[PDB]
């Protein structure tokens, strides 16, 4: 049978040193009384204000409510995507920013303070890690450049429905074995754990488990976590090892600081993209007579791709969460209004393209060129629309509370003459395909 080790086992420390060395551990004691207080009160403050939410996530094609409740805090405009769900930051106050409710704002400041301290620690541990290998500095600093933390809460008494750990008999899992997605390559992750107050790991206490990827022969590690212990995954650990969370019996919070790989995941980035798409529009005035500067296939393809990007990675992702951030802050209210306007204009662009493709004096070579440059984009738009609407109407989603109910948005009826094109592109895509096979 597969087995596991905790500090009670003779072989624990040396197995740690041999098969999990890039896993570091700083016990509550390395951290000041002061910061412990501030940070814990900050957790309880967010919890009281109802700021943590279960994500209606996706996994092997199945909609599933995560047993754990979460919240994302970080640099303004930043996102972190896991399990097909883009979490938007509730902003903490980096330099250059000034706003979002009192006690909540103060909690954000506090997790920024925590972010700072843990960063300093991570850099020190990676320095040590290298000098241990000795027998760039900018790489280290960018691998500890935490731009977000993902907070988690679970109260096992309230959230009993928990799976047994299958390979090492670690007992009950809060979070099953996984790799953390969407992180900068080789970037560290720093977790502050806070648990509110014989053969194997003690079930009453929280543990983080690690195993080697592909491997259930090498026994796994189960590391006990009390109030205020911190652990760190350094470097390639998150890629070479898997981790899970073993549930104790008391509620527990954690702050999991990460370098989210946000090259296509920031308000700034998606605004530059929308703008790039709108470069193809005549923009003297904002009205519905949409007229484009060019129908070169490359420019049109690009436009429709950006159209999809803002619709499905930004708008539908944001509204699937049914405006639950509105509880914590309004930071994204204006930006999302603006992205919605940019997208509406793009529905305008697509319409103008469909107008061209139907234009009498257009040589069929060129028409077919247009079709072949946009067809993929439009069928992807259709398939992703079926997906999001269904995901918004699924039995599970309809049972969430009213301030969390998924919201299929934007959405308009075929009768709605405010919008230039139907929500259901099925017929249109059929038509374009048919044209493309005309002898
Ligand atoms: O399959 C599961 O039960 C499961 C549970 C989780 O909590 C996570 C995952 C899977 C991920 O895949 C993942 C990826 C990137 C960052 C993350 O934080 C997670 C998770 O947290
Ligand atoms: Zn994880």
From Swiss-Prot:
EC numbers on record: 1.14.11.-, 1.14.11.53
Family: Belongs to the fto family.
Assembly, per entry: Monomer. May also exist as homodimer.
Record-given protein name: Alpha-ketoglutarate-dependent dioxygenase FTO
GO terms, molecular function: broad specificity oxidative DNA demethylase activity; ferrous iron binding; mRNA N6-methyladenosine dioxygenase activity; oxidative RNA demethylase activity; transferase activity; tRNA demethylase activity
Keyword Nucleus: yes
Listed result of changing residue 82 to A: Abolishes enzyme activity
The protein's enzyme class: oxidoreductase
Chief place where the protein resides: nucleus
Amino acids binding 2-oxoglutarate: 152, 231, 252-254, 256, 258
Residue numbers of N6-acetyllysine PTMs: 163
Residues that, per the record, bind substrate: 70, 82, 178-181
Subcellular location: Nucleus; Nucleus speckle; Cytoplasm
GO CC entries: cytoplasm; cytosol; intracellular membrane-bounded organelle; nuclear speck; nucleoplasm; nucleus
Tissue expr: Ubiquitously expressed, with relatively high expression in adrenal glands and brain; especially in hypothalamus and pituitary. Highly expressed in highly expressed in acute myeloid leukemias (AML) with t(11;11)(q23;23) with KMT2A/MLL1 rearrangements, t(15;17)(q21;q21)/PML-RARA, FLT3-ITD, and/or NPM1 mutations.
Field pH dependence: Optimum pH is 5.5-6.
